[PDB]
Amino acid sequence: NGNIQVGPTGQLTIQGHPVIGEGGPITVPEGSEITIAADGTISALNPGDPPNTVAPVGRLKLVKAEGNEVQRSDDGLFRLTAEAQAERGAVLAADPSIRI
Amino acid sequence: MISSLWIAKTGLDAQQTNMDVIANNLANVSTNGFKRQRAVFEDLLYQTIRQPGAQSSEQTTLPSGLQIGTGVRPVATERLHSQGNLSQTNNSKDVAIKGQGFFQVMLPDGTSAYTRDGSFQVDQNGQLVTAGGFQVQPAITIPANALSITIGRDGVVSVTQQGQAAPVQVGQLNLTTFMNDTGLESIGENLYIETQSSGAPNESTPGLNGAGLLYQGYVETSNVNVAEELVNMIQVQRAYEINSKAVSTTDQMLQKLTQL
Amino acid sequence: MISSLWIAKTGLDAQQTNMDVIANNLANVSTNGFKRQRAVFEDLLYQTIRQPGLQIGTGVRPVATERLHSQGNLSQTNNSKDVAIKGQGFFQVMLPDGTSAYTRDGSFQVDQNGQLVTAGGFQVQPAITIPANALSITIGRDGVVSVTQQGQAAPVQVGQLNLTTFMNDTGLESIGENLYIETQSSGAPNESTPGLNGAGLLYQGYVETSNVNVAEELVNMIQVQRAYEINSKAVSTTDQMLQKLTQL
Amino acid sequence: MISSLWIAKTGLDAQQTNMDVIANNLANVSTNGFKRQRAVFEDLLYQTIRQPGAQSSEQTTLPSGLQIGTGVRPVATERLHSQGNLSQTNNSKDVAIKGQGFFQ
Amino acid sequence: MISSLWIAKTGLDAQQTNMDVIANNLANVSTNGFKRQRAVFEDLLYQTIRQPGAQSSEQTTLPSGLQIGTGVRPVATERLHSQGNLSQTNNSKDVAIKGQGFFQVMLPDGTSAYTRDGSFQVDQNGQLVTAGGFQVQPAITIPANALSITIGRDGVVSVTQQGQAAPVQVGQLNLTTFMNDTGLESIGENLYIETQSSGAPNESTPGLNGAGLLYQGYVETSNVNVAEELVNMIQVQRAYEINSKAVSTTDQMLQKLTQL
Amino acid sequence: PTGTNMQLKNVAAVMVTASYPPFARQGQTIDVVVSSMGNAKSLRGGTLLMTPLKGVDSQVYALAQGNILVGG
């Protein structure tokens, strides 16, 4: 689900779950316009300011996992199977080849 | 209900405004002291969608991203304050301006208006008024038994009475100049009033630091160039054609969606 | 569900975007110093099916519109205050909030206390102060604004009209009323005198007209209408196939 | 809307300027000490769709590329300062100049 | 969206480029030292499909396969550098070239352009400049109290002073000739800048090596032949109408394809 | 160069306040309070560069530089 929604405090949540970036959960400046990039780079623009101040604030963590390595949990979110957990670690390393 | 239809509607309205300006310019060809008007348009807003200059990828940025524009809207109509060609009407009371000045008149309300037209008459009381009966400042009083009225280049109004070899001065016609001449509010009746964008009225003698020279027996006709108006009429007609075609094309597209 | 409705929908939306661009180009055919826009379409992600080799598409999505920065035709205004640009360059105009935008519309006026402003009233950098008793305003090819006064037989130098040149003219942000602001894709606004360092020249009494060619827009409208009809037919075919499926 | 239309529009203004100059010259036939005007025109902008002399290939160069031009513009209206014919009015107060001087 | 429509699009736009060439030639009829332009068109791509020459039936080749072509593109516009008609204006400052030479002019930015318009003026310092204020090279300076200026057909310039019965040479007007005169880039203002396709500037005094001869009191009028322009109008209109007819036919075909 | 665009993200302009203690002698150290002055999100692990602490008489009485401790 790519339907990302901002909050009044500025954090990125998907279905109420905060989005995970390279610095952990993604927090974006409050009241800013966001442009996700082909590699997940998040650029924040403050309204009123000139377009010269567009500066990135983080990067979405995009991971690659086939259907064999993921099993659905009871809350609708997929997670690594035990084998795949022991093979590729508990925390998946982000793949830079993923386009978005 | 669909964006392209609003954009084409705005285009149609702008072209209709341009045609209205053209028709107004052509309707005032015979008006003395008339200045032709030209409208200037601007585009309206721009939908952001994808902010250009954003990070397209960690090391690269988006060059000239996706901006969707709205229609068009007229900014303002500017006058062309240029010396309209002069004409000899051989009348002692017609006055024309060679430079950049204006005559001052008093409205019945007590306020002061400014007119460039110099077709003047005399009322029953002997004061110099315009064609609409408004009393021209500074209130030159022409006496009962006048034989000839002489208005010089510097604005002196003199009356030559019977049997006197010297002429009697009865007033002094001054001209008002503005910092921004196009900013005046036209109320019709060949009258312009001062606004805050037209600076302040600077009174000056006709021949001094930039007021024009007054010519007696001359009238300043309108500066409307008619061949330009015909070519612009052709242009406006073709543009209205194209905008109406855009409207019709959008109409044809929505029909297929209704049919779906 | 999983089908072709979305493919066709993404297609229609692209034709709608192209038609919006065409309508914007046509509506601004009378604006002075307007650069036509062209929308670039470039397809979505592909889904790969593995054999014991084939890739299915997903649709089309608009990426970025480009403004064509060619030199438009000049027209006549016989107004001494209007200047057009021969070459590549932008007039710098100061917005009320304080940030400087960049415009190519050369139709200027003098405001109530001197000062050269655009048609919207915003002041034009570098600031000019025209004297009140000016008889004729002359703007030279190299941007020197000289003013003649009655009596003195020599014109008085007032200001220089500097042109701001960007290395990438397409990346400027169009803020609306014939104004562009610099962006990260069009950085480093280079101020120069007109005529040197690649800056354009100035023609006084002329204004630069729009860049919109008409035939391209009309034929593109024909193509957009017909492609929209095609995508609508595809949507209808998918609808009928799903209707036949559900009736089982 | 069409470039050809703008080019013709200018040309029309240029010819109208020529006509106005001719009319003004004819209107001042009997005036003394008059100098007839003459208008000079020049090329307007030149759209460089294809650059003349562009290096199309590493060996061949494109000669005289696509230089689409815009209309015309009058450079100026210069007065022809030449000695007009002298005429004898036979008045003591009438003076005429033979060379290139001016009265102040 | 369909091939025939793209081919017809090239067609309309190219007949317009013609139309622009015709309009540019017409607008500069009164321009002194103007050269008329002519556009050249070429064929666009040709889709191979069946390859012509490929062997069918082992011993029989296939002649003239499906070379389906795309539209048209204009190659380039070439100026017709021919001698325009000389017009006598009886001026000491108008110079006309009768051969194949160019005057050299210095732009204030440092580089040099080349012009054929011979209407020269004198600045406040006495230099011979172009009507646009650009200073001619070499650099003819004219004395203050000049009574008559004589420009010979050899390019020598003489000034007759008072009290001197012998004219004094104050300069020498040279002509610049090029290998290819069509390769000069026209920058407007009757000025050409040298490009790499026009060779290098060859200086020559008027009468030798080919440079033309300079006439005083004459101006080289434009070589635009106008009846040819009208006949070209009639074609540029009929061809555009026919291409639009092709567009309409393709539109009808696509409409019936859609409606079914 | 005077004409250039600097868009920093790791620098904040701050005001430093301190108390000049009784009978203070040169070379002694005092505590300072560092407060941001414009649109800065945080001062978590920043370092205060050389700052001259003026008095009411606009004379330098102390020089401030160190690592800021923010609660967290």
Coordinates of C-alpha atoms in Angstrom, one line a residue, chain E:
Chain E
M1 CA -1.5 8.3 -33.1
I2 CA -1.5 7.0 -36.6
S3 CA 1.2 7.2 -39.3
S4 CA -0.7 9.1 -42.0
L5 CA -1.6 11.8 -39.5
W6 CA 2.1 12.3 -38.6
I7 CA 3.0 12.4 -42.3
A8 CA 0.3 15.1 -42.9
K9 CA 1.6 17.0 -39.8
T10 CA 5.0 17.3 -41.3
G11 CA 3.3 18.5 -44.5
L12 CA 1.2 21.3 -43.0
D13 CA 4.1 22.6 -40.9
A14 CA 6.5 22.6 -43.8
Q15 CA 4.1 24.5 -46.1
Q16 CA 3.9 26.9 -43.2
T17 CA 7.7 27.2 -43.1
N18 CA 7.3 28.1 -46.8
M19 CA 4.7 30.6 -45.9
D20 CA 7.0 32.1 -43.3
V21 CA 9.7 32.3 -45.9
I22 CA 7.3 34.1 -48.3
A23 CA 6.1 36.5 -45.6
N24 CA 9.7 37.3 -44.5
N25 CA 10.6 38.0 -48.1
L26 CA 7.6 40.3 -48.5
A27 CA 8.1 42.2 -45.3
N28 CA 11.6 43.2 -46.4
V29 CA 10.7 44.5 -49.9
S30 CA 11.6 48.1 -48.9
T31 CA 14.8 47.0 -47.0
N32 CA 18.0 48.2 -48.7
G33 CA 20.5 45.5 -49.4
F34 CA 18.2 42.6 -48.7
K35 CA 18.4 39.1 -50.2
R36 CA 15.4 36.9 -50.6
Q37 CA 15.3 33.4 -49.1
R38 CA 14.2 30.0 -50.5
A39 CA 13.6 26.9 -48.5
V40 CA 14.7 23.4 -49.6
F41 CA 12.8 20.2 -48.5
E42 CA 13.9 16.6 -48.3
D43 CA 12.2 13.3 -47.7
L44 CA 11.9 11.9 -44.2
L45 CA 12.4 8.2 -43.2
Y46 CA 11.5 5.2 -45.3
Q47 CA 10.4 2.1 -43.4
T48 CA 12.1 -1.0 -44.9
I49 CA 9.4 -3.7 -44.5
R50 CA 10.1 -6.0 -47.5
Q51 CA 13.7 -5.3 -48.5
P52 CA 14.2 -4.4 -52.2
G53 CA 16.8 -6.8 -53.6
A54 CA 16.3 -9.7 -51.3
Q55 CA 16.2 -13.0 -53.1
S56 CA 12.8 -14.6 -53.4
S57 CA 12.5 -18.1 -55.1
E58 CA 16.3 -18.8 -54.7
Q59 CA 17.0 -17.3 -58.2
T60 CA 14.6 -14.4 -58.5
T61 CA 15.1 -11.1 -56.6
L62 CA 12.4 -8.9 -55.3
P63 CA 12.4 -5.4 -57.0
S64 CA 11.1 -2.3 -55.2
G65 CA 9.8 -3.7 -51.9
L66 CA 7.6 -1.8 -49.4
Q67 CA 9.6 1.4 -48.9
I68 CA 6.8 3.1 -46.8
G69 CA 8.0 6.6 -46.1
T70 CA 7.4 9.2 -43.5
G71 CA 6.7 12.9 -44.2
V72 CA 8.9 15.8 -45.2
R73 CA 11.5 18.0 -43.4
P74 CA 13.0 21.3 -44.7
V75 CA 16.7 21.0 -45.3
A76 CA 17.7 24.6 -45.1
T77 CA 16.9 28.1 -46.3
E78 CA 19.4 29.6 -48.8
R79 CA 19.7 33.3 -49.7
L80 CA 19.8 34.3 -53.3
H81 CA 22.8 36.6 -53.4
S82 CA 22.1 38.5 -56.6
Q83 CA 22.6 42.1 -57.5
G84 CA 19.6 44.2 -56.5
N85 CA 18.4 47.2 -58.6
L86 CA 20.3 50.4 -57.9
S87 CA 18.2 53.4 -56.8
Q88 CA 19.5 57.0 -57.0
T89 CA 18.8 59.1 -53.9
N90 CA 21.4 61.8 -54.6
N91 CA 23.2 61.6 -51.2
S92 CA 26.9 62.0 -50.4
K93 CA 26.6 59.2 -47.8
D94 CA 24.7 56.4 -49.6
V95 CA 27.1 53.8 -51.1
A96 CA 26.0 51.0 -53.3
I97 CA 27.9 47.8 -54.1
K98 CA 27.6 46.6 -57.7
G99 CA 29.7 43.4 -57.4
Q100 CA 30.0 40.7 -54.7
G101 CA 31.5 42.5 -51.7
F102 CA 30.5 43.3 -48.1
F103 CA 31.2 46.2 -45.8
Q104 CA 32.9 45.3 -42.5
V105 CA 31.3 46.7 -39.3
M106 CA 32.5 46.4 -35.7
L107 CA 30.0 45.5 -33.0
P108 CA 30.8 47.2 -29.7
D109 CA 31.2 43.8 -28.0
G110 CA 34.4 43.4 -30.0
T111 CA 33.6 41.1 -32.9
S112 CA 32.9 42.2 -36.5
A113 CA 29.8 41.7 -38.7
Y114 CA 29.3 42.3 -42.4
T115 CA 26.6 44.4 -44.0
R116 CA 25.7 45.4 -47.5
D117 CA 23.3 48.3 -46.7
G118 CA 25.2 51.4 -47.6
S119 CA 23.2 54.1 -45.9
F120 CA 25.9 55.6 -43.7
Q121 CA 25.7 58.4 -41.1
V122 CA 28.2 60.5 -39.1
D123 CA 28.2 60.4 -35.3
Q124 CA 29.0 63.4 -33.1
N125 CA 32.7 62.5 -33.3
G126 CA 32.8 62.5 -37.1
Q127 CA 33.1 58.7 -37.7
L128 CA 31.3 56.9 -40.5
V129 CA 28.8 54.6 -38.8
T130 CA 25.8 52.5 -39.9
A131 CA 22.2 53.8 -39.4
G132 CA 22.0 51.5 -36.3
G133 CA 25.0 53.4 -34.8
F134 CA 27.6 50.7 -35.5
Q135 CA 31.0 52.0 -36.5
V136 CA 32.2 51.0 -40.0
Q137 CA 35.8 49.6 -40.3
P138 CA 38.5 50.3 -41.3
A139 CA 37.5 53.6 -39.6
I140 CA 36.6 56.7 -41.8
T141 CA 36.9 59.8 -39.8
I142 CA 35.4 62.9 -41.4
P143 CA 36.7 66.4 -40.4
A144 CA 34.5 69.0 -38.7
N145 CA 34.1 71.7 -41.4
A146 CA 33.5 69.4 -44.4
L147 CA 32.0 71.0 -47.5
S148 CA 31.7 67.9 -49.6
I149 CA 32.4 64.2 -49.2
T150 CA 33.4 62.2 -52.3
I151 CA 33.5 58.4 -52.1
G152 CA 35.2 57.1 -55.3
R153 CA 34.4 53.7 -57.0
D154 CA 37.8 52.5 -55.7
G155 CA 36.7 53.1 -52.1
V156 CA 38.8 56.1 -51.5
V157 CA 37.2 58.9 -49.4
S158 CA 38.0 62.6 -50.0
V159 CA 36.9 65.7 -48.1
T160 CA 36.9 69.2 -49.6
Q161 CA 38.0 71.8 -47.0
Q162 CA 37.7 75.5 -47.3
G163 CA 40.8 77.3 -48.7
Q164 CA 42.1 74.0 -50.2
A165 CA 41.3 73.4 -53.8
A166 CA 42.7 69.8 -53.6
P167 CA 40.7 67.2 -51.7
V168 CA 42.4 65.3 -48.9
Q169 CA 42.1 61.5 -48.6
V170 CA 40.8 60.7 -45.1
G171 CA 40.4 56.9 -45.4
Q172 CA 39.9 53.9 -47.7
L173 CA 36.7 51.9 -47.8
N174 CA 37.4 48.2 -48.3
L175 CA 35.1 45.3 -49.2
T176 CA 35.0 41.9 -47.6
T177 CA 34.5 38.8 -49.8
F178 CA 33.9 35.2 -48.8
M179 CA 34.2 31.8 -50.3
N180 CA 30.5 31.0 -49.6
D181 CA 28.2 34.0 -49.2
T182 CA 25.2 31.9 -48.2
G183 CA 26.9 30.6 -45.1
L184 CA 26.9 34.0 -43.3
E185 CA 24.6 34.0 -40.3
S186 CA 22.1 36.8 -40.5
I187 CA 21.7 38.4 -37.1
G188 CA 19.2 41.0 -38.1
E189 CA 19.9 44.7 -38.5
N190 CA 21.1 43.9 -42.1
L191 CA 24.2 42.3 -40.4
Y192 CA 25.9 39.0 -41.2
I193 CA 28.3 37.2 -38.9
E194 CA 31.0 34.9 -40.2
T195 CA 30.5 31.1 -39.7
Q196 CA 32.7 28.1 -40.4
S197 CA 30.6 27.3 -43.5
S198 CA 31.3 30.7 -45.0
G199 CA 35.1 30.4 -45.0
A200 CA 37.1 33.3 -43.7
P201 CA 36.9 37.1 -44.5
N202 CA 39.0 38.2 -47.5
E203 CA 39.7 41.9 -47.5
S204 CA 39.9 43.5 -50.9
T205 CA 39.7 47.1 -52.1
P206 CA 36.9 47.7 -54.6
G207 CA 37.8 46.8 -58.1
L208 CA 40.3 44.0 -57.7
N209 CA 40.1 40.2 -56.8
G210 CA 36.3 40.5 -57.5
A211 CA 35.1 42.9 -54.9
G212 CA 32.5 45.1 -56.5
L213 CA 32.6 48.8 -57.4
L214 CA 31.2 51.4 -55.0
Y215 CA 28.7 54.0 -56.4
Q216 CA 27.9 57.2 -54.5
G217 CA 24.4 58.4 -54.3
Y218 CA 23.0 55.0 -55.0
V219 CA 21.4 52.3 -52.8
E220 CA 21.1 48.6 -53.5
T221 CA 17.4 47.8 -53.2
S222 CA 16.1 44.4 -52.3
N223 CA 16.0 41.7 -55.0
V224 CA 12.5 40.5 -54.0
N225 CA 10.4 39.6 -57.1
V226 CA 6.8 40.1 -55.9
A227 CA 4.7 38.4 -58.6
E228 CA 6.7 35.2 -57.9
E229 CA 5.7 35.7 -54.3
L230 CA 2.0 35.9 -55.2
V231 CA 2.2 32.8 -57.3
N232 CA 4.0 31.1 -54.3
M233 CA 1.1 32.3 -52.1
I234 CA -1.4 30.5 -54.3
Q235 CA 0.5 27.3 -54.1
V236 CA 1.4 27.6 -50.3
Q237 CA -2.3 27.9 -49.8
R238 CA -3.5 25.1 -52.1
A239 CA -0.9 22.7 -50.8
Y240 CA -1.8 23.5 -47.2
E241 CA -5.5 23.0 -48.0
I242 CA -4.8 19.6 -49.5
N243 CA -2.7 18.5 -46.6
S244 CA -5.5 19.5 -44.2
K245 CA -7.8 17.4 -46.5
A246 CA -5.6 14.4 -45.9
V247 CA -5.7 15.1 -42.1
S248 CA -9.5 15.2 -42.3
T249 CA -9.7 11.9 -44.3
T250 CA -7.5 10.2 -41.7
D251 CA -9.7 11.7 -38.9
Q252 CA -12.8 10.2 -40.6
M253 CA -11.1 6.8 -40.9
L254 CA -10.1 6.8 -37.2
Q255 CA -13.6 8.0 -36.2
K256 CA -15.3 5.1 -38.0
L257 CA -12.7 2.7 -36.5
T258 CA -13.6 3.9 -33.0
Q259 CA -17.4 4.0 -33.5
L260 CA -17.7 0.5 -35.1

